[PDB]
């Protein structure tokens, strides 16, 4: 070791001093002093070449580093951990697959053997929002109504729903609602909601649909405006369009009508509805009136309307029909 260092320091000193030893360095230092860097140890490279040089150095470093990773992957102190992890995965997967491992098939075969002999001898989710325990804006908790107890077709014995109408015959179809009376509903019967068709051809009107929809409910996303009108006719819906929001040329189709789910459904009172959807994108009689509620816009998307199954089916009808 020390021979190389002695050689280095020896090379370091005598490279600097000139020729002509002290008998003539008294001359040589005098004429150098009266006369007036070094490019061997420390040299300044030009920037034209340092870029290529550093890039080649980095590629060489990359090569060395890949070689060391690969030959670090060869030693037995790594192969032991690799086989350990692989045998662990193999035993876990073998226990999982043997847990996945014919009696039913045998029974079926037996039935086939028999039934054949005999022949030879011869020849859904309910309305879950109605089941929600806290009836809205009321001090009344409903009864716990399970999923097997949904329809009226089967009988659960201690089933005593407390009747509660708001002091302002029928059975609830499709689900036991746990409370009797009209409640917040007006009549003791199927109150009908109606819904005017609000749509327009959206931007890029090839397979699109926009609709002027209202966000005045301080709730989830935009639904089209409407109202529970007088049931049974369509001119009353035209008057409801004139009232809550003349026109001659129109029609009404895609009428989803019937039992709609609510957190207000009772034993004898429930809500039903009739929602239609149908429609250049102008609709000049519809752009004539300016709608006032401030939260109301032109919903150009059909992303399931962010509301209950009525609005999701309404968005599905406009996504399928156009």
């Amino acid at each position: 070791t020390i021979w190389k260092f002695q050689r280095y320091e020896l090379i370091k000193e005598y490279h600097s001093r000139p020729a002509l030893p002290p008998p003539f360095i008294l001359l040589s230092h005098l004429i150098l002093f009266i006369r007036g860097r070094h490019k061997n140890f420390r040299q300044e490279l030009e920037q034209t070449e340092e870029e290529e040089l550093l890039s080649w150095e980095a590629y060489m470093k990359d090569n060395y580093l890949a070689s060391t990773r690969q030959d670090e992957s060869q030693s037995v102190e790594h192969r032991i951990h690799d086989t350990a992890e692989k045998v662990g995965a193999m035993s876990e997967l073998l226990e999982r697959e043997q847990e996945m491992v014919x009696x039913x098939x045998x029974x079926x075969x037996x039935x086939x053997x028999x039934x054949x002999x005999x022949x030879x001898x011869x020849x859904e989710a309910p309305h879950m929002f109605a089941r929600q325990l806290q009836y809205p804006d009321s001090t009344v908790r409903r009864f716990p109504v399970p999923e097997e107890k949904v329809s009226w077709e089967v009988n659960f014995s201690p089933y005593q729903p407390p009747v509660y109408n708001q002091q302002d015959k029928h059975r609830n179809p499709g689900g036991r609602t746990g409370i009797r009376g009209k409640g917040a509903l007006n009549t003791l019967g199927p109150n009908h909601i109606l819904h005017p068709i609000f749509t327009r051809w959206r931007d890029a009107e090839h397979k699109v649909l926009e609709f002027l929809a209202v966000w005045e409910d301080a709730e989830k996303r935009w639904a089209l405006l409407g109202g529970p009108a007088q049931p049974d006719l369509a001119q009353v819906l035209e008057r409801i369009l004139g009232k809550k929001l003349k026109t001659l040329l129109k029609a009404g189709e895609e009428v989803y009508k019937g039992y709609v789910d609510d957190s207000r459904n009772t034993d004898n009172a429930w809500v039903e509805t009739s929602i239609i959807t149908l429609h250049t994108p102008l609709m000049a009689d519809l752009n004539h009136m300016v709608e006032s509620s401030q939260p109301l816009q032109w919903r150009e998307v059909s992303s399931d309307a962010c509301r209950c199954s009525y609005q999701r089916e309404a968005l599905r009808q406009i996504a399928h029909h156009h």
């Binding site: 070791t1 020390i2 190389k4 260092f5 002695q6 050689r7 280095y8 320091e9 020896l10 090379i11 370091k12 000193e13 005598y14 490279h15 600097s16 001093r17 000139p18 020729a19 030893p21 002290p22 008998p23 360095i25 008294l26 230092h29 005098l30 150098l32 002093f33 061997n40 140890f41 420390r42 040299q43 300044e44 490279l45 340092e50 040089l53 550093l54 080649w56 150095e57 980095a58 060489m60 470093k61 090569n63 060395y64 580093l65 070689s67 060391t68 859904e124 879950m128 089941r131 325990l133 716990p144 109504v145 399970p146 999923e147 097997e148 201690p158 962010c306």
Partner: protein, 739 residues
Amino acid sequence: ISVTGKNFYIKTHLKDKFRRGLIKVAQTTGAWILTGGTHAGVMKHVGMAVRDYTLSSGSMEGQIVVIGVAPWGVIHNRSTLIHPEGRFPAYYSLDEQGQGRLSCLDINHTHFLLVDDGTQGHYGVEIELRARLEKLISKLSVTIPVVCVVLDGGPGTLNTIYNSMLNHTPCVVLEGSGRLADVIAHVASVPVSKVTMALINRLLKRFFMQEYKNFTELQIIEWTKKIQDILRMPHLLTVFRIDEDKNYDVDVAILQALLKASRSDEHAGRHCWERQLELAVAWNRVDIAESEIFTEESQWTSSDLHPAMFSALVGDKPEFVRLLLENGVCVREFLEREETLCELYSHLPSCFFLRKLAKRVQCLSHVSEEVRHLLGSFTQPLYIASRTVWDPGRDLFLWAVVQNNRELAEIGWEQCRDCIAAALAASKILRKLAQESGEDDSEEATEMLELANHYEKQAIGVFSECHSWDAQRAQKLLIRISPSWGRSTCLWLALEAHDKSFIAHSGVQALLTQIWCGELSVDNPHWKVLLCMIFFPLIYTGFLTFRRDEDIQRQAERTEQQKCSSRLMSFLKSPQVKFYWNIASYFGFLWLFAVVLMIDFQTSPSWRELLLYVWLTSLVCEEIRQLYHDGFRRKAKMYIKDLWNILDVLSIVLFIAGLICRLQASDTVFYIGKVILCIDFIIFCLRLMAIFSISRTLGPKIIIVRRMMLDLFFFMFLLSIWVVAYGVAKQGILIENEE
């Protein structure tokens, strides 16, 4: 986190794993823990757990808040607390012996809400408020993540689960817990088929062993409806397998519930994933973040990660910062503002460095003083006050290898440019702090030396592969000056760093020999050089190949395969001939000085004495030229730091003292001058002796001087006491009383 687990019999293994996990999720984030306040059971269990942690940290940081909500009428000694005056410290009497209804507070909590409905006999009324509180501090701001954990339970657990999950604050259920938790863990399939009163009655007979005769039909049907309403929301609930040694504790459960909540959420993809990751770094779960949020579909930008990865670098998270730099964090964009680097050196953890740095403090520009002191001071200073090339990788690797985070430091180096320079500079600063470590820390110091050895092996590996690739480019690479890392070069920095296994590489020895022969060839032997040193025109006659002729023959050959006064002066400017010629002149100096020390030594100086005077003026002139080419007093301080030049300074000052005493007239100072000149002669001969064996280093010479003066002093001391006591015993035998 709210824990809403009176009679539960968990076995000790799960209780210990849950205690340690809930503490390790308490100490991490600075997070609130919400519990019912009664000292029965699991609320007192988490009270004792947080008491054990808050003794374990010594109240130095955090003081984890346990706000509790408890019903007014169910508490024991409230009339000791019912004063209309306020701010008074009341005392509570726990006594462990309350009535069968009225249980007492757990005093290991810290905050108390007591809810008062006037029922005074029932536990149930209080909860309808409590989950509402959760929504409020979920509505406070991005939103705060909210999660409840659930253990053994009863009827109260089921009601608080139901009144939580109807408010979108999701919940985790621990497996193996007993009463209600194993019930919800058993219902993991058949959303329509399993919800029957018969199967729930079978399960509640299977688990609720002792209390099963307390059931009535109204309560079992309210239970069945509640669990059907709970299980119908499968994207907020998660059953959670037991805390095992196969990389699963409560941190994984809290993360997976946060993500199965935020996946199917309405608007979580715009802003929730930020605080998701910022929490995910704090627990060091690399695989969960790697498999959950760094998926192919996310398509982020690289500048937005720059907060989060910073924390992963401020607390020594190596695998996670590899995951970040693989996923898209780029170190060039990272270090744009210098305030980030100032923050990095602010948050530097405890080591030998910052302990040595705050002394110089009592500022990134402040760091360079401790750097250039820890490094050799012959370099330039770096890290200037205002953007001295910026070079982010050098800064990052410098920070890393100072703070000694080893597996972080490899990541610091693999991203760096200018590889061999930085590798050897890391070796130099490591060996410098290894030597300068005075406070013992022997494991720390041997880790320092092992790290320096590692980087020296890395540098010689890279350079060995470069030298096997090309030859002359590697010789271009060694003598390069570096724009980065100040003003040093590789060969100088390894020479000063004394990296003993690098300078003894084949290529660097070939370059050293190729300088040491100079303009002559590198192949001829040295005895022909001595024979050329004998006769002056025999250089015209000798074989004596040159660099110019050799290369020309070599250059011409490659092409074919592919398809008077200046010459003697160029001989004269070799270093080898200069060395031999100088040492022969030095031998002649010894000969004439030894001649006129003895013989031609009259009162007035003689002829050859004047020749000795002019050779010593020649030596001091050569020395002042050496000082003139390699502030000014700083240059003198760097000059005297050698071993040969201190001997030449001592020699010339002793010669000029002996000479100025040789001007005198008295015979005593004449003899004193002869004495000074003779001891100066042997100092010169000792310098010629040390022209071969010794080196220019002073450090280990000082240490060897101390440790051998110690041993010589000690053996001389015991020799002295043996000498003195034997002599005085012999005097006490072989003389009488008088002396």
